[PDB]
Every structure is written in C-alpha cells, then in structure tokens.
C-alpha cells in the first residue's frame, strides 16, 4: 500500500485516518491532517473517500 502520516501513527491511504467526513467532527485538527499528509502521493486520492458522503446527519 501507499501510506499516510499523523506523527504518532501510519496507515494506508485506503482506510479512514480517524473517522468518515472528518472535517465536520474535528475541523481545526483536520486542518493538521493535511499538514502531516501534506506532500505525499496517496492521501490526495483518499480525500475522494474522506470528505465525500453522509455521516449520521450531514449529507456532503
């Protein structure tokens, strides 16, 4: 696989870094997930599935 970063941990660009549609739940640290994943090839193709769909009230 191709790998993400969150300083304490690393995982594939093909599983949720924390939770689905992260920015609505955790905004000012979702700003920081893109300071950690900042300049690598994988995560800009996981954003396609990580700021994408409906949580349990939000729809996009």
């Amino acid at each position: 696989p191709v790998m993400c970063l969150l300083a304490n941990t690393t995982f594939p660009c093909s599983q949720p870094p924390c939770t689905p549609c992260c920015y609505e739940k955790e905004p000012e640290e979702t700003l920081r997930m893109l300071e950690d994943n900042v300049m690598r090839p994988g995560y800009y193709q996981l954003l396609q599935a990580s700021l994408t769909c409906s949580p349990h009230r939000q729809r996009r």
């Binding site: 994408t52 769909c53 409906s54 729809r59 996009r60």
Partner: protein, 242 residues
C-alpha cells in the same frame, strides 16, 4: 422534435448498487442539463439531481447526496460538430434499500440556457423500473380457482382464476388463447408481505355454463421461461365438469 432513451428495467439484491444509463438526441439546442427524477409507484415525484454533459458539474437535491452519484460522458465532438447533437448521462444508485424501488426518469432541463436559473422538465425519457429485494426468482403457484356452490340461473354468478407466489412481477395471462376478450377483468398486482407477487383474472357471466363450457386460461412468466395452461371447473371436496 427531440427524444431521450434509457436502460431497460432491472432487479437487484439490497446493499448492492446499480447504474442507469440515458441517451438524448435530435434537438437543435446544444448545452441543456440532463436531470434525473424518481417515483415510488404513485406515491410522489422527486427531482434527484443532474449534470451539464459539456461541463460535468454534477448537481444534487440534498436528499440524495451519499445515496447517489451522477455522471455524463464527453465525446470527440468538434467545435463545428455538424451532426444531430447527442448526450449520455447516468445515475449510480448505491447502498440500495428496498424503499429505493421506483420508476426513474431522465428529463431535459433548460436551466443553464434560460439565463442560469431553475427550469421545468422540458422532455422526458420512457422511464425505467428498479426493483430492490432479497427474494429468489421463484416461478408462480398456478392452481385453478374453484367456482363456489352455485347460486343458479335468473341472474349472474361467480367465475375466475388465481395466480400466486412468484418473484419478478411481469407475468401475463390469456383466456381460451385470446378467444375470450370482453367480460375479463384481471386484477393487476398484489404484494404478499414478503417479496412474492399475486394476480387474479375473472369473467362475470349469467349462471348458464359452469360444469359445461371449456373455460381455460394460459399463464406466462419470465423466470426459467415458465408457461402454463389450465381449466377452471368446480373441484374442491367433490367435482362437476364438462
């Protein structure tokens, strides 16, 4: 004038996904939107979203975001084009629920061309049907309906037929292979509280001809290409027939 044509009707297991394809052609106008609407049978009529096939630019009614995606195909159409114009569009229905069972329409939307505003649905496809259920493709129970203990002459009395216990709804039926036409009512559908369908077909008559006439009916179904034919004479605890 103009026409739209779309995928044949389809049947699916819940929790899967399905894509409906649309094509439009022959109008003079170039850059209209194509839009998708849906209708649970007679229960409503909902606009879902659309695209402009030139720009992509997918646009959604908020109720469908996450449960659908919309796309269209760009083509090697030159700046001059010099043909009848054409477009191709889709809804991908995803994470299917049995409540998604509906007819889906493609329609032309003039919103972009009419000064980038909302518009009415100008021309429509045929519509196409999506069926969502876990059921297996069971062919019907096809027994003859028995006429009751006869009320006799001086009026009109019971005569008919019953079909039950099938999946895929598109059965058909025919009395005396079409030699009986008038007086036939066929009750269109029933849902048996767990995916299976049912149908009945009936012939209102004067009481003259029970146990006497060759009343006979065909039944036809698409699963396993099953086809059937039966007489409808009185038989229950005892019998009286032609």
């Amino acid at each position: 004038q103009v026409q739209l044509v779309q995928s044949g009707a389809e049947v699916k297991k819940p929790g899967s996904a399905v894509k409906v394809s649309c094509k439009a052609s022959g109008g003079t106008l170039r850059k209209y939107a194509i839009s998708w609407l849906r209708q649970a049978p007679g229960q409503g009529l909902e606009w879902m979203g659309g695209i402009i096939p030139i720009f992509g630019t997918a646009n959604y009614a908020q109720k469908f975001q996450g449960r659908v995606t919309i796309t269209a195909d760009e083509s090697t159409t030159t700046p001059y084009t010099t043909t009848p114009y054409t477009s191709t569009a889709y809804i991908e229905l995803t994470s299917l629920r049995s409540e998604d069972t509906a007819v889906y329409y493609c329609a032309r939307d003039l919103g972009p061309l009419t000064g980038y505003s909302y518009s009415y649905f100008d021309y429509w496809g045929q519509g196409t049907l999506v069926t969502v259920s876990s059921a297996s493709t069971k062919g019907p129970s096809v027994f003859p309906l028995a006429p009751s203990s006869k009320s006799t002459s001086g009026g009109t009395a019971a005569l008919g037929c019953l079909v039950k216990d099938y999946f895929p709804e598109p059965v058909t039926v025919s009395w005396n292979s079409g030699a009986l036409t008038s007086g036939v009512h066929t009750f269109p559908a029933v849902l048996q509280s767990s995916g299976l369908y049912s149908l009945s077909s009936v012939v209102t008559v004067p009481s003259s001809s029970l146990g006497t006439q060759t009343y006979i009916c065909n039944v036809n179904h698409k699963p396993s290409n099953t086809k059937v034919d039966k007489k409808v004479e009185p038989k229950s605890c005892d019998k009286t027939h032609t």
